[PDB]
Write an enzyme that holds these catalytic residues in place. Structure first.
Site, short mmCIF file in Angstrom:
data_model
loop_
_atom_site.label_atom_id
_atom_site.label_comp_id
_atom_site.label_asym_id
_atom_site.label_seq_id
_atom_site.Cartn_x
_atom_site.Cartn_y
_atom_site.Cartn_z
N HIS C 132 43.47 30.16 41.35
CA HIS C 132 43.45 31.45 40.67
C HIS C 132 43.17 32.58 41.65
CE1 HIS C 132 41.47 34.54 37.93
NE2 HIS C 132 42.82 34.66 37.84
N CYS C 151 34.23 30.70 38.74
CA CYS C 151 34.54 32.11 38.75
C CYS C 151 35.26 32.57 37.49
CB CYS C 151 35.39 32.46 39.95
SG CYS C 151 34.37 32.55 41.44
N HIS C 152 36.35 31.93 37.08
CA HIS C 152 37.01 32.43 35.88
C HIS C 152 37.29 31.29 34.94
CE1 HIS C 152 37.71 34.91 39.25
NE2 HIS C 152 37.47 35.90 38.42
N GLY C 153 36.63 30.17 35.20
CA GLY C 153 36.65 29.09 34.24
C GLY C 153 38.02 28.45 34.14
#
Ligand SMILES: CCCCCCCCCCCCCCCCCC(=O)OC[C@H](COP(=O)([O-])OCC(O)COP(=O)([O-])OC[C@@H](COC(=O)CCCCCCCCCCCCCCCCC)OC(=O)CCCCCCCCCCCCCCCCC)OC(=O)CCCCCCCCCCCCCCCCC
Ligand SMILES: CCCCCCCCCCCCCCCCCC(=O)OC[C@H](COP(=O)([O-])OCC[N+](C)(C)C)OC(=O)CCCCCCCCCCCCCCCCC
Ligand SMILES: CCCCCCCCCCCCCCCCCC(=O)OC[C@H](COP(=O)([O-])OCC[N+](C)(C)C)OC(=O)CCCCCCCCCCCCCCCCC
Ligand SMILES: CCCCCCCCCCCCCCCCCCCC(=O)O[C@H](COC(=O)CCCCCCCCCCCCCC)COP(=O)(O)OCCN
Ligand code: HEC
Ligand code: HEM
Ligand code: HEM
Ligand code: HEM
Ligand SMILES: CCCCCC[C@H]1C(=O)O[C@H](C)[C@H](NC(=O)c2cccc(NC=O)c2O)C(=O)O[C@@H](C)[C@@H]1OC(=O)CC(C)C
Ligand SMILES: CCCCCCCCCCCCO[C@@H]1O[C@H](CO)[C@@H](O[C@H]2O[C@H](CO)[C@@H](O)[C@H](O)[C@H]2O)[C@H](O)[C@H]1O
Ligand SMILES: CCCCCCCCCCCCO[C@@H]1O[C@H](CO)[C@@H](O[C@H]2O[C@H](CO)[C@@H](O)[C@H](O)[C@H]2O)[C@H](O)[C@H]1O
Ligand SMILES: O=C1C(O)=C([C@H]2CC[C@@H](c3ccc(Cl)cc3)CC2)C(=O)c2ccccc21
Ligand SMILES: O=C1C(O)=C([C@H]2CC[C@@H](c3ccc(Cl)cc3)CC2)C(=O)c2ccccc21
Ligand code: FES
Ligand code: FES
Lengths: 71, 383, 186, 244, 124, 54, 85, 111, 110
Positions: C132, C151-153
């Site tokens: 990502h 960080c953003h799952g």
């Protein structure tokens, strides 16, 4: 053998003859002055650096191009 | 009404670079202003770029400059461009101040841009110097020592200020890191002042080489001076290219490629070519405080030209005697430059003092006297 | 001198063919040439100048990192630095490999089977940077019990395939070779 | 100052790289590296040059890897945190003869042999100074010169007394290309090599400058045409005055 | 410096026989070398005008003299930018170099200096 | 000649497009031309000229 | 002291007719040969003394000083140098 | 000979002065000295000139043995120090500072 | 609308400034923050990934990145002060709005 040895000798006997004699005379005078006693306890000790530099500066001017041409 | 005039933001740009009414007869010496602008832009671009690669810590600074030269792509260019443009900046700024002194740009109504200019000149000196120190070569460290000790001249508090500016007992890491901070900062301050002196000038408009009003005959800044300024941009870049690409080290001191050793100073101390005139002034005066005062006064004394020029006529185009005096003054300033880089030996010690006296006597004696006499010669001579 | 209708003499300067298209075209050739050299010069200046920001020569040193495998127990993931990026090396158990081979490849943002990813089923080697935005996923966590980028799952699998979350691709596989059966080079 | 205190100024030799469009002679660079490696490296470091810097200048990738791989460099500690050495790689720097300044001075009767990576930029004269110095030891010091102990007379060095003895003698190096290794030849090669060391961008720099000179010349010519063209209405302006 | 200063000092010189004998020839040569006449200026065209006092003096010029001044400045600006000199009738002949402005500025300044003086008067 | 003006110069869009396409051609050819020229004036000097020995 | 277009602050102008031609209609380099040779010679000649006098004087001064300095640091100049210090 | 010891980043000149050097120093009439001091005031032991080797003008380190008073010469603005390290010629206002030094042994000093 | 729109750019510059400043500490959040922001350009297709590397000056966030963030974090605030000044200059044509949203031309205060 080293091309510089021959070029320097040639330039000393030839275009830089005046400066070669100056250096020669100088060394003669200074060596003779060192030979004389109570030279160590003198005020002014003459060297021949100036004359040497005049000679070397001259030789370099008349040789630099010639030397690099044979390398 | 044209957008360029309607919109407040565009209108400010317009008033400076497009519709700005300029005299129609400015000669090539009016081009230094834009070259100094170009130098300032080059310096910001290359400077910020070097700041992306340079490390301010004293243990790494010199090595980071070598890393810039060797490892960073085009680092050599960016570094030499930054260093050389600093030299060109001074050629151009002495040219620009030269132009202003010759054509009486310092007289009313332009005393304000002149006086702001004198401060830009001081800031350039401090910027360029602070930048010299960042290399942290031998000259860099010694230069730092001397400049930070000019405040020791200031009595009593002086010695403590010195230690405060070094952040230590000697020039070291602390000093180098604070010089980096300030060298990055100082150019933006300098660009503010450069802008301000233009804003101050915008009330009177540019002077012109005749020194008469140009209100009778104005030309838009663009296209005329825009295209005129390109000629010097390209002539400048030609000279820039010859230094940057062909002889990048001609204007430099070898000793700055030796890392800073606080234990020795080089036997041949000679500062940047552009500081040489004031350095010779500092050497001339045999007193600590004296030497410093004289050196600073050599710049600050420009502030009094508005007073001491008593001429009723603006600038030197029409004043044969003033032009000769100006020629001798300029040549003396170049002689001071030369004496700045000889050895401190006879007979140049006395010569440097005579040149220092002549430098100051131009502002204090000769200019007031000559300008008075020429006033009278114009009046009598034309009756 | 007096009449304003007698235009001053301009004959020393006036071009005879001032109104020809050839005449304009010549001056536009000059302006265009100047634009062309300015454009060539600008591009060259920007290109050379901005390249300073591209990786410097010293950074461009390559690694070739050799790692042992005897050390690594079953059901564990190591992190080997290689080019500053972490390399996850997992010593996958038999049932882990089975779990990975299950998911229908059809329903996978980045459709790949474990066979394509590993060259040896017992050595999942990946560049352990989340595809990502570039954090390093915390292993053993997740929802597909492989790796979870905190960080953003985004959830990676036991193949290190992306299953849930913003990451678009599966965890990159470096160029790795088993020199011995007990050591790989990256 | 006296001539002595300044040093004699070196002759201006016609180096291959002098001249706006001239590169280094890379063959000379390679020969000069061999002089550095076999003579100077005993005392002088070349700390700013990495093996990779020789690649595609003087040596192929393979020859430089061979030079790096012969040495041991400090690795990262092993798994017990004990120190380790590894064989050198191309990113490693060419290692110095001495671990610190003090060891350097100890080996050189107090004098410190400078790092040579920058010496061509760090001395007035550059290549010429290095060549003049290396070849400029007279058999006898000029009569009257008193050398400090452990100093050798060399007029090119300021003061005259240099802590470095004459080191190049005919055939101290055996060149791999069969060039006669004379004092002058080795000095020219090593001087060239050191000048490259100081300014490795030299070749690229001069080439880009050539392109820049050409473009900037053309732009300067055109800019003058365009300026004259745009200004011609103003230059050509004529006035008729009828006093009112 | 003020024009008043320059004019009074010039008058001191022209009074003294000795002084005039040595100064008038100097000043005439100076003016020839100055070369403002070669751009068709009158001496007075060169006086700095960006001053309250001078702006007021220039507003006092008769329309004729004012229009001609504008023309000479325009014409000189054009010579300057062309890097040409005046030729023929454009060159200011010594007889045409009249001090058209000096009377006006001397009146302006006379009042301005009287004003300064009277601002500092002390009733006795 | 009118035609050439009309096509490449009259519209500024076209003129700027022509200048940038010319700058592209100039940039590529100038690079190649100087490369060859630089190799001819420094013949036998450069690494590419001695590389073959190794 | 300077205004802007429309109100520049020129004393009123009357009676000047200004004429010029288009840049496209003019030869920008007309009489360039004449100017480059004869005009530049004129302008150079007229300014020559203002450059030559100070340059020649300060070059003389520098020359004398540099020759004296050189001479003082020779063997011949020993005595004169001893007096100077 | 003169050594240079770093101490607080500033260099310390330590000169092992000969008998005739000390004599030369004791000669100059103290009257004619920007900073009037005799060698006796400066050194605590005539054979050990210990000074903070930073030039009192602007702060370079003078090159020893050079000068005109054959002691030290600051190359930056040409100020000459003596064998006592007293200023004789040039812009420097004070004589080279003496640190606080003590002879712990006769063969070692601390600064 | 002009001071507003210049303002929106000041807001973006503040975000980038304060962020670049965060990274300079080079603590754990700093390094990861740097990774994330420079990879937002990876979103841009094709060239995107090369841009990321160009911004880092490396293959990862490291020394090169930190030194360039230092340079730009020092710079960005001066750019931001320019824009702050510009949006005031843009506002100076209309003057401040007021809480009633009516003209204030009727009643002004220095
Ligand atoms: C640095 C970065 C590079 C950029 C280049 C910028 C330099 C350009 C500039 O300002 O000078 C050009 C400048 C040309 O400018 P110009 O606008 O044609 O006339 C400016 C003078 O006021 C006009 O002066 P003039 O009309 O009296 O002409 C004088 C000039 C003749 O001018 C020439 O053009 C030659 O000749 C001399 O003064 C030479 C002295 C004699 C030598 C023997 O050259 C000079 O006149 C230099 C004279 C300085 C002494
Ligand atoms: C070096 C010596 C300088 C002498 C200059 C004398 C004037 C001259 O002849 O110059 C030509 C020209 C003469 O131009 P001018 O405008 O006086 O005359 C043009 C022609 N007439 C008179 C007919 C209108 O002067 C300049 O352009 C001088 C610019 C001065 C720049 C000085 C830079 C020195 C930096 C030191 C900074 C402190
Ligand atoms: C630095 C960037 C250079 C970019 C060059 C791209 C083309 C622009 C150019 O050279 O000017 C042509 C154009 C216009 O030049 P012009 O204004 O002479 O052309 C208008 C007249 N016609 C279209 C009929 C020829 O310049 C611009 O549009 C401004 C860009 C400046 C560069
Ligand atoms: C910032 C510093 C400004 C100074 C510029 C001088 C030259 C810098 C460029 C490097 C260079 O040498 O370029 C050469 C060509 O010269 C050229 O063509 C460049 C000379 C042109 C100078 C003026 C043109 C624009 C300058 C600044 C404008 C800014 C706008 C965008 C950056 C080599 O060519 P190469 O092979 O290296 O080129 C790559 C594509 N072939
Ligand atoms: C065994 C010792 C030794 C060898 C071998 C040696 N040098 Fe040196 N060199 C020194 C020392 C010591 C100095 C410092 C001399 C001094 O500062 O008095 C020095 C100084 C120099 C200097 C600079 C002198 C200066 O200006 O400061 C150069 C350049 C130099 N050496 C190059 C070389 C080159 C090139 C070689 C061989 C090709 C070489 N040296 C071989 C010991 C050596
Ligand atoms: C960063 C440095 C500087 C820049 C970028 C700069 C820029 C300019 C510019 C663009 C102009 C108007 C055009 C011109 O006349 O050339 C100008 C005019 C002027 N500058 Fe500067 N300048 C700088 C430094 C100085 C200095 C140091 C001085 C004075 C000591 C100075 C004094 C003036 C004056 C008096 C004018 C009005 C001159 C006139 O047009 O008659 N400037 N400057
Ligand atoms: C007027 C503007 C500037 C001037 C006159 C100036 C001058 C200089 C000078 C003379 C040096 C010494 C260069 C050398 O010999 O290596 C230098 C170095 C430096 N300057 Fe600037 N500078 C300017 C603007 C800037 C700016 C805006 C930055 C932004 C950071 C900057 C960053 C640097 C850096 C990092 C160095 C040290 C690296 C080096 O030496 O190249 N400079 N500057
Ligand atoms: C560095 C950041 C900023 C500074 C220092 C700044 C400063 C100011 C100041 C002093 C004013 C006038 C007085 C006031 O209304 O408070 C103002 C007005 C304004 N600012 Fe900002 N500002 C900044 C950022 C922004 C941003 C991010 C926006 C919009 C996104 C913005 C939009 C405006 C607008 C629209 C006005 C006019 C508002 C009004 O008075 O009705 N500013 N700003
Ligand atoms: C973009 C709008 C922002 C306004 C400021 C930008 C610059 C600006 O005003 O440019 C103008 C082109 C200006 N020249 C002149 O006045 C000029 C006037 C008369 C004759 C000539 N030439 C003669 O033949 C001139 O060249 C110039 O070079 O001065 C820079 C220094 C300005 O930069 C700044 O102060 C801000 C900062 C970058 C220093
Ligand atoms: C990077 C810094 C950010 C701001 C920098 C931009 C340029 C500098 C502008 C500051 C000076 C503005 O100060 C003022 O602005 C106005 C608005 O155009 C200008 O005004 C000028 O032009 C206008 C119309 O073009 C005329 O009505 C006016 O008579 C004249 O003075 C002048 O320039 C100045 O009197
Ligand atoms: C205003 C900004 C607009 C966005 C533009 C983005 C530009 C940034 C990209 C950097 C591009 C650099 O890309 C790289 O450039 C260098 C020169 O710099 C080229 O390098 C080439 O010429 C240089 C000299 O110029 C030689 O040293 C080199 O041996 C040769 O390969 C490379 O072939 C190319 O790979
Ligand atoms: O001794 C000096 C010295 O004096 C200056 C000088 C010259 C210019 C001075 C200066 C000139 C003008 C101003 Cl407004 C301020 C300082 C600054 C100090 C240096 O730059 C220098 C650099 C390196 C080593 C020694 C020295
Ligand atoms: O994972 C993230 C992340 O996603 C953001 C960020 C990314 C960009 C920020 C942002 C950039 C641009 C704009 Cl216009 C608005 C916000 C907002 C949150 C961070 O700042 C971050 C900081 C430290 C560690 C991890 C992270
Ligand atoms: S960073 Fe990996 S989930 Fe966004
Ligand atoms: S620095 Fe010591 S003499 Fe000025």
């Amino acid at each position: 053998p080293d091309p510089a040895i021959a070029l320097h000798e040639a330039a000393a006997e030839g275009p830089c003859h005046d400066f070669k004699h100056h250096f020669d005379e100088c060394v003669e005078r200074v060596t003779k002055a060192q030979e004389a006693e109570d030279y160590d306890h003198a005020e002014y000790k003459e060297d021949c650096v100036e004359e040497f530099f005049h000679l070397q500066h001259c030789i370099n001017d008349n040789t630099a191009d010639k030397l690099f041409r044979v390398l | 009404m044209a957008l360029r005039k309607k919109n407040s933001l565009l209108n400010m740009a317009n008033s400076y670079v497009l519709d700005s009414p300029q005299p129609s007869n400015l000669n090539y010496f009016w081009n230094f202003g834009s070259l100094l602008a170009l130098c300032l832009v080059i310096q910001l671009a290359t400077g910020i770029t070097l700041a992306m690669h340079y490390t301010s810590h004293a243990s790494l600074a010199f090595d980071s400059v070598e890393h810039i030269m060797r490892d960073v792509n085009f680092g050599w260019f960016i570094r030499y461009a930054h260093a050389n443009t600093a030299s060109f900046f001074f050629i151009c700024i002495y040219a620009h101040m030269g132009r202003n002194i010759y054509y009486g740009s310092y007289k009313t109504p332009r005393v304000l841009p002149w006086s702001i200019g004198v401060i830009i000149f001081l800031l350039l000196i401090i910027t360029a110097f602070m930048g010299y120190v960042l290399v942290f070569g031998q000259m860099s460290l010694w230069g730092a020592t001397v400049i930070c000790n000019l405040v020791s001249a200031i009595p009593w508090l002086g010695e403590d200020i010195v230690h405060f500016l070094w952040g230590g007992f000697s020039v070291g890491n602390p000093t180098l890191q604070r010089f980096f901070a300030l060298h990055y900062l100082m150019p933006f301050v300098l660009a503010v002042f450069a802008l301000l002196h233009l804003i101050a000038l915008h009330t009177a408009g540019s002077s012109n080489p005749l020194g008469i009003t140009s209100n009778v005959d104005k030309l838009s800044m663009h296209p005329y001076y825009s295209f005129k300024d390109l000629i010097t941009v390209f002539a400048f870049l030609l000279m820039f290219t010859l230094f940057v690409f062909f002889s990048p080290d001609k204007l430099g001191h070898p000793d700055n490629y030796i890392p800073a050793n606080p234990m020795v100073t080089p036997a041949s101390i000679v500062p940047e070519w552009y500081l040489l005139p004031f350095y010779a002034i500092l050497r001339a005066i045999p007193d600590k405080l004296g030497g410093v005062i004289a050196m600073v006064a050599a710049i600050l004394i420009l502030l009094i030209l508005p007073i001491v020029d008593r001429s009723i006529i603006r600038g030197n185009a029409f004043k044969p005697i003033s032009k000769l005096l100006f020629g001798f003054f300029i040549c003396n300033f170049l002689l001071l430059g030369v004496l700045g880089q000889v050895h401190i030996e006879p007979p140049f010690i006395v010569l440097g003092q005579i040149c220092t006296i002549f430098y100051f006597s131009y502002f204090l004696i000769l200019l007031p006297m000559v300008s008075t006499i020429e006033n009278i010669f114009f009046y009598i001579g034309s009756l | 001198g007096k009449s304003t209708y007698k235009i001053p003499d301009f004959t020393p300067y006036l071009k005879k063919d001032r109104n020809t298209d050839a005449n304009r075209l010549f001056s536009y050739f000059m302006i265009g040439s100047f634009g062309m050299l300015s454009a060539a010069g600008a591009k060259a200046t920007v290109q050379d100048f901005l390249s300073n920001m591209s990786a410097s020569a010293d950074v461009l040193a390559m690694a070739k990192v050799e790692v042992k495998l005897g050390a690594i127990p079953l059901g564990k993931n190591v992190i080997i630095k290689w080019r500053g990026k972490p390399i996850f090396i997992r010593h996958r158990t038999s049932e882990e490999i089975e779990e990975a081979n299950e998911v229908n490849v059809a329903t996978l943002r980045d459709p790949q089977t474990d066979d394509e990813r590993v060259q040896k089923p017992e050595w999942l080697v990946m560049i352990g940077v989340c595809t990502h935005l570039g954090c390093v996923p915390i292993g053993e966590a997740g929802d597909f019990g492989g790796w979870f980028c905190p960080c953003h799952g985004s959830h990676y699998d036991i193949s290190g395939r992306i299953r849930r979350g913003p990451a678009p691709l599966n965890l990159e596989i470096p160029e790795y070779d088993f020199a011995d059966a007990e050591t790989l080079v990256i | 100052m006296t001539a002595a205190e300044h040093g004699l100024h070196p002759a201006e030799y016609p180096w291959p790289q002098n001249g706006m469009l001239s590169t280094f002679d890379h063959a000379s660079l390679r020969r000069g590296y061999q002089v550095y490696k076999e003579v100077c490296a005993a005392c002088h470091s070349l700390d700013r040059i990495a093996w990779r810097n020789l690649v595609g200048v003087t040596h192929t990738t393979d020859e430089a890897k061979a030079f790096a791989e012969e040495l041991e460099y400090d690795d990262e500690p092993d798994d017990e945190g004990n120190p380790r050495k590894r064989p050198g790689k191309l990113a490693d720097y060419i290692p110095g003869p001495y671990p610190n300044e003090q060891a350097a001075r100890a080996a050189n009767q107090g004098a410190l042999p400078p790092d040579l990576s920058l010496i061509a930029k760090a001395r007035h004269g550059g290549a010429d100074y290095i060549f003049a110095l290396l070849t400029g030891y007279p058999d006898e010091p000029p009569a009257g010169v008193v050398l400090a102990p452990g100093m050798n007379y060399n007029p090119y060095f300021p003061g005259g007394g240099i802590g470095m003895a004459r080191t190049l003698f005919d055939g101290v190096v055996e060149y791999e290309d069969g060039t006669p290794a004379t004092t002058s030849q080795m000095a020219k090669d090593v001087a060239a090599f050191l000048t490259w060391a100081a300014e490795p961008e030299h070749d690229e720099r001069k080439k880009l400058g050539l392109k820049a000179i050409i473009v900037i010349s053309a732009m300067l010519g055109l800019s003058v045409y365009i300026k004259k063209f745009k200004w011609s209405p103003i230059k050509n302006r004529k006035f008729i005055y009828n006093p009112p | 410096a003020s024009i008043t200063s320059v004019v009074k000092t010039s008058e001191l010189i022209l009074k003294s026989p000795l002084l005039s004998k040595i100064v008038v020839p100097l000043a005439k040569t100076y003016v020839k070398f100055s070369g403002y006449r070669q751009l068709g200026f009158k001496m007075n065209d060169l006086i700095i005008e960006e001053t309250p006092n001078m702006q007021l003096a220039l507003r006092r010029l008769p329309p004729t003299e004012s229009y001609d001044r504008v023309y000479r400045l325009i014409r000189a600006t054009q010579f300057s930018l062309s890097h040409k000199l005046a030729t023929g009738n454009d060159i200011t002949k010594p007889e045409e170099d009249d001090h058209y402005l000096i009377p006006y500025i001397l009146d302006v300044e006379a009042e301005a200096f009287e004003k300064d003086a009277l601002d500092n008067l002390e009733v006795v | 000649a009118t035609t050439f003006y009309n096509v490449f110069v009259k519209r500024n869009s076209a003129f700027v497009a022509t200048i940038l396409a010319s700058a592209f051609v100039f940039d590529m050819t100038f690079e190649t031309a100087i490369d060859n020229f630089w190799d001819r004036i420094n013949a036998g000097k450069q690494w590419k000229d001695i590389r073959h020995k190794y | 002291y300077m205004g802007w277009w429309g109100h520049m602050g020129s004393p009123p102008q009357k009676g000047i007719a200004g004429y010029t031609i288009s840049p496209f209609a003019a030869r920008p380099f007309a009489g360039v040969v004449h100017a480059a040779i004869f005009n530049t010679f004129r302008r150079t000649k007229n300014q020559a003394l203002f450059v030559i006098l100070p340059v020649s004087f300060f070059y003389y001064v520098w020359t004398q000083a540099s020759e004296k300095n050189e001479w003082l640091y020779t063997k011949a100049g020993r005595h004169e140098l001893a007096k100077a210090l």
